[PDB]
Design an enzyme around this catalytic site. Structure first.
Site, PDB file in Angstrom:
ATOM      1  N   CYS A 115       0.833  -1.172   0.000  1.00 49.43           N
ATOM      2  CA  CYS A 115       0.000   0.000   0.000  1.00 49.43           C
ATOM      3  C   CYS A 115       0.869   1.223   0.000  1.00 49.43           C
ATOM      4  O   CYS A 115       0.395   2.300  -0.325  1.00 49.43           O
ATOM      5  CB  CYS A 115      -0.895   0.056   1.253  1.00 49.43           C
ATOM      6  SG  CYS A 115      -1.867  -1.457   1.381  1.00 49.43           S
TER       7      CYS A 115
ATOM      8  N   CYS B 174      -7.097   1.142   2.356  1.00 43.20           N
ATOM      9  CA  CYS B 174      -5.742   1.584   2.582  1.00 43.20           C
ATOM     10  C   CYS B 174      -5.507   3.054   2.343  1.00 43.20           C
ATOM     11  O   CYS B 174      -4.455   3.476   1.847  1.00 43.20           O
ATOM     12  CB  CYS B 174      -4.685   0.720   1.815  1.00 43.20           C
ATOM     13  SG  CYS B 174      -4.822   0.656   0.012  1.00 43.20           S
TER      14      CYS B 174
END
Lengths: 142, 121, 121, 142, 142, 121, 121, 121, 142, 121, 142, 142
Positions: free
Chosen positions: A46, A116
């Protein structure tokens, strides 16, 4: 928030990523050396690692200070800033039950689906859990 | 990946690191009890003859040894335990999971231990 | 014993493998519905009033570009989606998602569409 | 629940995987070349891979034949065998309907809490859905 | 209930394809080479015609593309635009169950079956029914 | 071809071409389901040590794999199968046999599998 | 044109011949009323947060122009419209639309005046 | 032109195009069914002696082959129409009409048929 | 009940059966000649045989044409005739409704029960199922 | 071949072997009575113009000599019988069909005879 | 259920009637010559045949003796044996106790269905009916 | 079903169209010379036109006389005839004002439509509404 800034200007110049890290070049680069042992969370897929480090006055239960690390999106910096402001001067109670909505609301009207976007929620949660452990009380933690 | 909340959204690598289970939405109790109940159902080949789900009411047939029946009481402290093993107990949430108000310990722990204590010998 | 029934059992690699999205049979959908309900309400440019749920009832609020209600209808012709302009259309569960017996397949796509047509203009 | 017999049985001496490689071990081993384009699933986290290849009479929608590949544990071979026997001579819908407790029953006594004992559910669902998709109807995949 | 914007200005956007061609009008114009072969609808009572051409993955079920022709009101063009956008990148089932008070809301007001402003519902339904024939099932078509 | 009708009438063959399974319309199905379980089980008491069939409820005590229980679901989507396999699965008619509102699988065939897997191991 | 007479069948005329139209009473009149209502509503001088017609009971939250509420009166001059700027009236048919027996005008007209003045200023 | 779309508008080329059979709801289906009954009545000097419409009952009478009269059937599926030869089969919505959950058989057409077979033989 | 009318004489000796086949008698006779792969049914005790050959438009699911062979009872000739007239220009679904009604009426004096005199019940079931198989949607057949 | 309880197993010669009149239960008998009525109804020019089966009330119509209805008698000598000639009678069981205590009475034979006399003359 | 044994043991080797008959095979053998009538039921499709011969004390309506022939499955010999033993000394109609029902349980455990290897049901019903005919009672026969 | 004639035999010769057209064709004909301003209706692509001319006693609205023109089907003449008979000698309201049913019964077997073979409902509606407007009562009309 129309502009967090999302873009992040001026003289950043690509997010707060570069501004924070450093060390440049140096050919010995890597995160080192002190740490306070508070919560850390990060996903390499991420691209954002968040770290909220609390200090807590045990006697009054008040969060003395809380400072942040933001990586990834520049939108996230503003959320991190505003949360830490609020949390300081506010008891353990406030610093627990961590939202969720708070991160969403800051950026825009809450989408009610954040994948995320920020790990900031997780970072602080880890941090207060750590605090409870060290002072001894894992039954208020569970 | 995107949508909805909360389990679905995570990147599936923050799992180990502290997360909140959440009620989702408050039906929750039945699902958790069902999970516990399945553990109890089998792993003994010589005990636990029947597990019955009769929609809302729930019977669990367990062989020779003190028998308890647990089911969800309608909201007024919503678990009832019937037991001539150590007598009644009542449960309320203290941290998003049911904690005994007369032992100070979650129901799932009692069940796990008690059934598997039989599987031993 | 292991972890942990029913969704939990998978490796967490099942988000590209074919598995049931989620069956009900009376518990899952109401929680899922609630998550969806909150999600649809927010992010519009025009005012959206607060959705109010009173037990056994549910209002979904959308701006004054038209608004429909989401309610359960008792056995036979279940879960009527009473649209003031288009009338009610009835759905009976058919493939793990509510499928109208007057149209094509999947309930969720209707909600998605009409809400995002409102967010737009 | 009783022994199928389980892992490292018999006269292989250790399981299906070692016996039928070609090349053993060799740490550079590769599987080639014909495939039928049916379902593939594998979780190396759980140490297993399964590939069920169905053959389907598309007139009656009945499985003519189904063969397996099992990678995992020697005990697992027994589950794959029993299913393929059952599934043949029955409809596409019938072929699936595997989950948790059933996989456990096949392998001995169920804990019904099991975490990734076998992939067989994902594998078969994939295979039958793949057939319907190639048939040019994708309404039953979704 | 907001601008498309399609306030019929300057004369560029009413009506897209017709404006581009070259020759105009000419009262003997035929649209060629491109043809329909899927959804066709038109109400020449007010002079609005719409033609949707879908492309559909047989295996995936995903709508690869849809193209909208609008020979109608300027406001109406937007309704088509937003719908074709939405439908693309989303499955077959998204295309399915299209009312009739999605497109109407998009123009401004939700009433079902606008008189000469929404031919877009009729167009999409036609197209997908056509596709059902080519799918090779008549069971769900009726 | 005469009496009893519609079954037990033959011009010296029972069938020679397929015939779609009828409703007729509530009771028939309940008889069929109960029969299927018993038939599969027979000649083995290892798989299921004992069966009790009350009026309106079926119990099958097995301590050797856990237990699934069969009972009638209230109107609309009638019949209820509770199985610890995937949780309770709800079925509605779609072919003159009760077809799952998940993927589309007949309950009859699910019973086939689960009983003979027990006889096996 | 075959079916269904006479609101879905036309030989291309009757929209220029005098013949009565609408009426169910219950569904057709409300539907027509809504069409008119929404059509009139556009280009409002101040944003309208919602109109919900929940189940023949309608709340219309409009901070811009008139705060009339339209409901269905029980049998005895069926339908209710209360207009806050000229009071309550009750309507019964006389011309194939609900007509005031306190005025001699339809409820359709009340919407016309009050709503369309809002668009103006 | 305007109103009420698509059967009432006059371009008369929007009526040969595919569109859903109904849009509201169970009313249209019933209307179609009654329409068939009126059609059926002439061309018999006997084989229909009156069609009577009564609250919660429909009578089609055929004394030239015998008959049964239908009534409402409780939720799950509503209203069988399947003539003695194959026994009663209830009917549920499946896509714009009541289709039996076996085959493509629809209730209105089965009545149409039995009457014109009478003209035949 | 009413006359077809069928003479059922002379030199057949019983009923229509001789006219169709050809070669007569001959005690070495065979079933011939056109076939389209559709149903065939016959009961040996009732002396009847039926062969319905449908032609089907796969763009709408409409029976274009259906022609029949009838061997056996005079009533059965009428059963085949009347159903085949009706079904054409109408869908698959309509055909099944029409045959079920046709069987119950044709025999006449309805005793409810099934009959071997007209085989039409088995014959249409075979046809519609066969059609689905060739149309490649066997999942909805079962 | 296989299936079912009992005498439904067809070795293609069980139609000449004696078998019990019903295996389920009291309903079988009622079905037979109805079946007989359907056969009888054709071949009446005006003798039977009506047969409607309602909800446990069955009307037989003979306009040309008068008629009576048959219906279920509340529990205690269940199933009512009616005649104007010999007065009303009632039933019990003696074969699971009906009794013959006074004096050889079966509503299947009574109806059969009387209706088929009309077909005759 | 338990072992008769069905096959071979105890030195039959097939069934129990073959081990006394003689003539074998011979493909021209028949049931001859004196007979008591009673229930007889031959299934040629399932290939099993059973023949119950009752003897009845007329005065009390009690089975003096009852012998059986079992042809077919080895399991069926045991059902026939135990029932014939039991019913002796008890009133025949009451004694038989058979719908179905009981016969199925004896066989091994009941399938809760008629097996089709049991013909004892048709045989007994026929036999008791035959007794009533000879006893001159038609009232309770029907 | 009856014949008035509905072919309107003979030497008309095709229907009532040629009876009053007369002159044939002629492609220049017009309706001439006087008119009374009453209801007129015609539906092209139904091939019929009807014009009812009322005379009205201005007291309670009793129709003194009414004569008609019918162009179209022979069957169509019957509604105009029968309706004019009813309304004469009585008030208009209690012998008119029925749409679909009056038209439906009269043509033959009810279509359950008022369109468009018989225009007679629309023809009467136009005439009596026109009358009422001139009368100066229009608050019970509209």
């Amino acid at each position: 928030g129309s502009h967090m800034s999302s873009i992040t200007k001026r003289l950043y110049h690509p997010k707060v990523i570069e501004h924070y890290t450093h060390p440049r070049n140096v050919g010995s680069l890597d995160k080192k050396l002190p740490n306070v042992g508070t919560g850390l969370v990060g996903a390499p897929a991420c691209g954002d690692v968040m770290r909220l480090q609390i200090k807590v006055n045990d006697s009054t239960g008040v969060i003395e200070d809380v400072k942040f690390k933001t990586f990834g999106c520049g939108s996230a910096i503003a959320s991190s800033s505003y949360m830490t402001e609020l949390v300081q001067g506010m008891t353990l109670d406030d610093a627990a039950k961590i939202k969720n909505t708070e991160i969403a609301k800051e950026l825009s009207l809450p989408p009610v689906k954040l994948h995320c976007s920020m790990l900031a929620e997780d970072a602080i949660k880890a941090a207060i859990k750590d605090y409870k452990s060290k002072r001894n009380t894992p039954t208020m933690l569970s | 990946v995107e949508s909805s909340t909360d389990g679905q959204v995570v990147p599936q690598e923050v799992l180990n690191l502290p997360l909140e289970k959440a009620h989702e939405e408050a039906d929750d109790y039945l699902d958790h009890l069902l999970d516990s109940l399945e553990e109890l159902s089998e792993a003994h080949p010589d005990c636990i003859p029947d597990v019955e789900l009769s929609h809302g009411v729930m019977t669990l047939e367990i062989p020779a040894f003190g028998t308890y029946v647990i089911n969800k009481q309608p909201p007024n402290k919503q678990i009832w335990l019937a037991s001539p093993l150590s007598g009644p107990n009542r449960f309320d949430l203290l941290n998003g999971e049911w904690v005994s108000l007369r032992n100070g310990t979650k129901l799932t722990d009692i069940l796990t231990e008690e059934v598997e204590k039989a599987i031993s010998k």
